[PDB]
Design a protein around this nucleic acid. Structure first.
Lengths: 143, 103, 61, 53, 167, 100, 82, 141, 145
RNA sequence: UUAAUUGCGAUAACGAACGAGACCUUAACCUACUAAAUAGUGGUGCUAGCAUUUGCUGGUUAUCCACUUCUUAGAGGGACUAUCGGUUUCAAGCCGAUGGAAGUUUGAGGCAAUAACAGGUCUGUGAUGCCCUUAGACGUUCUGGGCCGCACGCGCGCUACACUGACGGAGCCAGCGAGUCUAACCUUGGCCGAGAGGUCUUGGUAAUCUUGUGAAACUCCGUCGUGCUGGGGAUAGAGCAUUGUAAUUAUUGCUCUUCAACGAGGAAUUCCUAGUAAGCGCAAGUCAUCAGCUUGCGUUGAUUACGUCCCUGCCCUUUGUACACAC
């Protein structure tokens, strides 16, 4: 038919793309996966432990598909959140820049996101076709 | 799932069974205090009935393992069948008895 | 409250003083006619002046 | 001498003064006005600043 | 160079600085107001006053001096700003002129009652619909009391007071 | 040559007729052009206490000023930059001729 | 100073943290009689701690008896499926 | 020149434009199908204009809606208002009144908010309090 | 179903690093009782020890607690970041250390006494009992004596 | 009767003036006008992915064409309670139903009369009378402290006292507003670092670039469990950076660790009638750096009145007074 990444729910697609990233870990595995806190606002490291890197990669790649150009600061602002500064009220805090940098470069190594003009990154031509093929799969898994 | 009738029917009969019919009012006028019983309008009966059910389940869910979902369900079901364990039913008894004594 | 100010009250009576047939028994038709007759600097003011005038046009009937 | 005014006033309230009375404390540096607030009220309707709402 | 928001804030400050300088210097000349007209390269600043002959003064040296005075203050270039001198119309309806005139009468030693009622009579005989002057301070004693001389009617609230009344 | 007439002022009426005069000079002769583009008004707002001292109930103020910006886009050779350059300037509004 | 408030909880009856055998026969023969079952129901009547109902509620849902009438955010409503 | 109409809608500050042209029955918002809302509870609230009258009138139209502004519920209220006005607009350039007038009567017979936008808007904050009516805590002694 | 039975190896209480470690709770949080170990450090120790995070303290094989214990007393040897320690660049030697249950409190007294003996501002205020980080004390810190 | 000495009307009073009202701004409406790559929309070309069967989702300023519904405005329109049915000398008007975007003077503000305080300010003023003072000056300036100092008592505020929760993942939507020239601001993007932050550059004098400010509260998956506990983060110890000539009685930011009171708060008391309260964050002001403050903006959005003078106060009239600095 005409299904695509926009013809799918967010939770199912990200888990499905995480599923089709753990089974063969082609992308990468950074050495400091188990010690990052994802931000200076978050108080605890992610409880996914073994994964959480292809889960972010799945979310980042899906975010790239619907947009044209982003940046590491843009990912930091999007993936950040409120920080409990003790008795002081909450405040928005950007995410960890190194984590999004490693994910973004990792997506470049496989061939799913590459650099774009006017700055920033952009979904890859091989990246667009495989990501769309994911959507054709996750819909028919429930069917 | 529990008490298998139409839940909307259960809601409407519960509020009609926990709405106070008589109530007391301030009449202190001049002299420390003093109560005096009056009646309750149908609109106030519904408003009081809803308020009593909400506060009862909210208080019973305070520092308790039971979630507000089952606490609301238990409060409405018990008030629907007119049992004494309901917070709203007990409160209706208090207001009616107070008004009856100060009649 | 909808109590009309004396400014719109006196002017409306003066309008009917010399213009019986001009102010028709309807509001919209003579609302612009009041503007053509009197120098009114506010659209709101002439709207209320015509409203009282039309109401007075109905009462005299 | 070289000790009269050796202190570096370029990063604080002592580095900025009003163009009318050179008054300290509260000033209006917004849009580069560099005027203190209380005489700004007196000369408000000279710069084009009016009050409708 | 300068953004539009800062540019228009600066020219109003330029107007404020120029107006106060003229008020403090040409106070005895019956100064009323100023219009700051800007045009590319050359700009003209029209000065309104009653004693326009003294405003220019002695062949025009004073007005040339005033042009040279604002020259060095505002950091312009030779021939960029020219000072004009336009006679004030309806001098009886300019509160700035009457306020200065009352100040000189009080400074000279003229009676407050005669001066205050003299100026208000001059105002409405010029074609005004109302005027009001307030004199406050230590008069006739140490304790300060305010005096109010008025005639006619004066609206006090709304848009029209700013549109009509000059204070 | 992409002459653009930029007008900024605080008085809407005086800026309107300047654009009207510029656009009326434009629609004369031939001068195919683009009409007045209505940029959003820049509303400055400085909020200040009314009290010069510190005593008194908290009563704030707001001294606002509106800037109306409209640009006029022309397109013609030198035979109108001998003609458009004749500024129709009223007190207040200003003009900045920008080509390309 | 003075507080004008009470300071006491009750008596914490701490119970199973790891599922045992003598109550494994209990659960398999006692929850299929629950007209309404959820996380809190067997916490009170069956006296089960925190991280055992969620496994037990996942236990029978995947295996047998009770069925997903409405399993959702922070509320797993199941019936006496028969 | 293919058949098409356009509308608009607001809730508090959002906007939603429905370019309802002639199609095979595609209802999409920001490139996603209508079944993917976000509150997942007001999905039937945006499903409303689909189900008051029936799906037969929706079989020859495709409503494409782009939304900007407001909260998640405000976006939902923008979508339902836009598609409801989009349906009448398609009936207000091609189809007869009996199709439209009972369409446009039944929509308001259930709720006026489907076509008529909410007139209430946020009120400006006044000095002396965190909000318009609210004031700071004053005390004596 | 992820249901398993118990045979009797569960111990209701533990004792690591000369302190009481209560069971009945997850291992990542049952190790927070040790004076000088928090939620993040306990998570790091458990992660590198491969102790199946979703495991109660009692339901832990003894061969894994020693591996956890050895990481506690020598974190830098087991690839732990140098920036994940409480005592960094010690004033005595400079090697990155990590104080433990009894070391956390004892080492705290030594540095205050070192501060006190040198007659520094922080040392004297610590002896006095007032704030040492510059907080206001006019309206705060009252119910202390 | 009205929010209103606002009107009907009565009448030794007539004619009037100020205030109120009127007026101005803003928030709402305009598929009617003027328009517009510094805002967009649709279409024609170039081009990508899925299915190819007919399509869907996209990218693309020199690929051009057409339009102004949404985006901004300028000139204007619209709202007067319109009609009907009741109530009223049957007048002012009031109430209910009969259009609307708007029927509590459409909502909210601005402006805001006479008289007065023996109200606040000589520490805003190169506005100030008088007194003190003017060279070991009470002037200016330099260096270091101080305004933060705590036995204690009060007033505004921020965190909470956990399941309508906390934590970890995802979805993840706004508005107001600001921003560098002979300076060094807002900073996009790439690289380095767990982070703070650093680094090489880019865009912007501004609807154009920061920025679609991808904000938070919010929702869906999981972790947890009724546990002074995964609630809560005061109190401290160590380390890493930023701002400055200088940070020591830590400016602030980041990391680890220590994990105290607090289990809904007593006499008493504060604010509030709709997008309002409340919850939530953002911008601006002070600013080299520092928000728990203030001024504005938007997000989610209740219950409860449509009344009273009982308490605390106000306006008019009658009445009484040994009060006049006036209970």
């Amino acid at each position: 038919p005409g299904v695509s990444v926009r013809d799918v729910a967010a939770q199912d697609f990200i888990n499905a793309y995480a599923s089709f990233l753990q089974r063969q870990g082609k992308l990468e595995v950074p050495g400091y996966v188990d010690i990052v806190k994802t931000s200076s606002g978050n108080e605890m490291p992610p409880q996914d432990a073994e994964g959480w890197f292809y889960k972010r990669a799945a979310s980042v790649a899906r975010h790239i598909y619907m947009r044209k150009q982003v940046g590491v600061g843009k990912l930091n602002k999007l993936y950040g959140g409120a920080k409990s500064r003790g008795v002081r009220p909450y405040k928005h805090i950007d995410a960890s820049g190194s984590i999004n940098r490693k994910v973004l470069q990792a997506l470049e190594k496989i061939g799913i996101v590459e650099i774009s003009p006017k700055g920033g990154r952009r979904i890859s031509e091989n990246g667009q076709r495989d990501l769309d093929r994911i959507a054709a799969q996750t819909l028919e898994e429930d069917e | 799932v529990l008490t298998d009738q139409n839940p909307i029917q259960v809601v409407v009969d519960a509020i009609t069974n926990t709405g106070p019919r008589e109530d007391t009012t301030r009449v202190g006028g001049g002299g420390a205090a003093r109560r005096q019983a009056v009646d309750v309008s149908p609109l106030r009966r519904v408003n009081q009935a809803i308020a009593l059910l909400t506060i009862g389940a909210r208080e019973a869910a305070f520092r308790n393992i039971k979630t507000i979902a089952e606490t609301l369900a238990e409060e409405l079901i018990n008030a629907a069948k007119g049992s004494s364990t309901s917070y709203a039913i007990k409160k209706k008894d208090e207001l009616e008895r107070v008004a009856k004594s100060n009649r | 409250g909808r109590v009309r100010t004396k400014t719109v009250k006196r002017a409306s009576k003066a309008l009917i003083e010399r213009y019986y047939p001009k102010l028709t028994l309807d509001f919209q038709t003579n609302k612009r006619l009041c503007d053509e007759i009197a120098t009114i600097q506010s659209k709101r003011l002439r709207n209320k002046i015509a409203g009282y005038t039309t109401h007075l046009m109905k009462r005299i009937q | 001498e070289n000790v009269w005014f050796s202190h570096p006033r370029r990063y604080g309230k002592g580095s900025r003064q009003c163009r009318v009375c050179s008054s300290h404390t509260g000033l209006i540096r917004k849009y580069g006005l560099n005027i203190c607030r209380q005489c700004f009220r007196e000369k408000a309707n000279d710069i084009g600043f009016n009050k409708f709402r | 160079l300068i953004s539009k928001k800062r540019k228009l804030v600066a020219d109003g400050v330029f107007y404020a600085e120029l107006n106060e300088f003229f008020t403090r210097e040409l106070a005895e000349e019956g100064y009323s107001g100023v219009e700051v007209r800007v045009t590319p390269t050359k700009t003209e600043v029209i000065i309104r006053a009653t004693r326009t002959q003294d405003v220019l003064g002695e062949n025009g040296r004073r007005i040339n001096e005033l042009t040279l005075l604002v020259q060095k203050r505002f950091k312009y270039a030779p021939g960029t700003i020219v000072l004009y001198a336009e006679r004030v119309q309806d001098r009886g309806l300019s509160a700035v002129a009457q306020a200065e005139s009352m100040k000189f009468k009080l400074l000279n030693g003229l009676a407050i009652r005669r001066a205050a009622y003299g100026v208000v009579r001059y105002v409405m005989e010029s074609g005004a619909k109302g005027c009001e002057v307030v004199v406050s301070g230590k008069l006739r004693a140490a304790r300060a009391k305010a005096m109010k001389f008025a005639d006619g009617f004066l609206i006090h609230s709304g848009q029209p007071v700013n549109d009509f009344i000059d204070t | 040559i992409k002459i653009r007439i930029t007008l900024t002022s605080t008085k809407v009426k005086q800026l309107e007729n300047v654009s009207s005069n510029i656009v009326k000079n434009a629609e004369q002769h031939n001068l195919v052009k683009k009409g007045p583009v209505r940029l959003p008004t820049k509303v400055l707002k400085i909020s200040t206490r009314k009290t010069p001292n510190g005593e008194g109930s908290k009563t704030w103020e707001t001294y606002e000023m509106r800037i109306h910006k409209r640009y006029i886009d022309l397109e013609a050779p030198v035979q109108i930059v001998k003609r458009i350059t004749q500024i129709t300037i009223e007190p207040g509004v200003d003009v900045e001729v920008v080509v390309a | 100073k003075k507080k004008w408030s009470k300071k006491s909880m009750k008596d914490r009856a701490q119970h199973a943290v790891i599922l045992d055998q003598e109550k494994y026969d209990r659960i398999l023969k006692e929850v299929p009689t629950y007209r309404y079952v959820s996380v809190s129901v067997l916490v009170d009547r069956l006296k089960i701690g925190g991280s055992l109902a969620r496994i037990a509620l996942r236990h029978l849902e995947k295996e047998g008896i009770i069925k997903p009438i409405s399993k959702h955010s922070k509320q797993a409503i199941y019936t006496r499926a028969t | 020149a293919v058949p098409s109409v356009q509308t608009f809608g607001k809730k508090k500050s959002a906007t939603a434009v429905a370019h309802v042209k002639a199609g095979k029955g595609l209802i999409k918002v920001n490139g996603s199908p209508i079944t993917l809302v976000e509150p997942e509870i007001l999905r039937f609230k945006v499903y409303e204009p689909l189900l008051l009258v029936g799906l037969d009138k929706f079989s020859n139209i495709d409503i494409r809606v782009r939304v900007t502004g407001g909260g998640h519920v405000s976006q939902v209220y923008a979508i339902r208002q836009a598609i409801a006005k989009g349906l009448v607009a398609y009936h207000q350039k091609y189809v007869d009144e009996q199709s439209k007038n009972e369409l446009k009567k039944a929509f308001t017979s259930y709720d006026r908010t489907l076509l008529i936008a909410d007139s209430r808007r946020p009120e400006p904050k006044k000095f002396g309090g965190k909000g318009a009516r609210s004031r700071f805590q004053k005390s004596y002694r | 179903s992820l249901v398993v039975q118990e045979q009797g190896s569960f111990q209701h209480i533990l004792r690591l690093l000369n302190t009481n470690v209560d069971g009945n709770i997850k291992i990542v949080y049952a190790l927070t009782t040790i004076k000088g170990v928090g939620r993040r450090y306990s998570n790091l120790v458990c992660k590198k020890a491969d102790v199946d995070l979703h495991k109660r303290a009692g339901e832990l094989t003894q061969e894994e607690l020693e591996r956890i214990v050895q990481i506690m007393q020598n974190p830098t040897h087991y690839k732990i970041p140098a920036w994940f320690l409480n005592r960094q660049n010690d004033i005595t030697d400079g090697k990155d250390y990590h104080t433990l249950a009894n070391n956390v409190e004892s080492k705290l007294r030594d540095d205050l006494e070192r501060l006190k003996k040198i007659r520094a501002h922080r040392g004297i205020r610590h002896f006095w009992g007032l704030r040492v980080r510059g907080q206001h004390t006019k309206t705060t810190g009252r119910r202390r004596a």
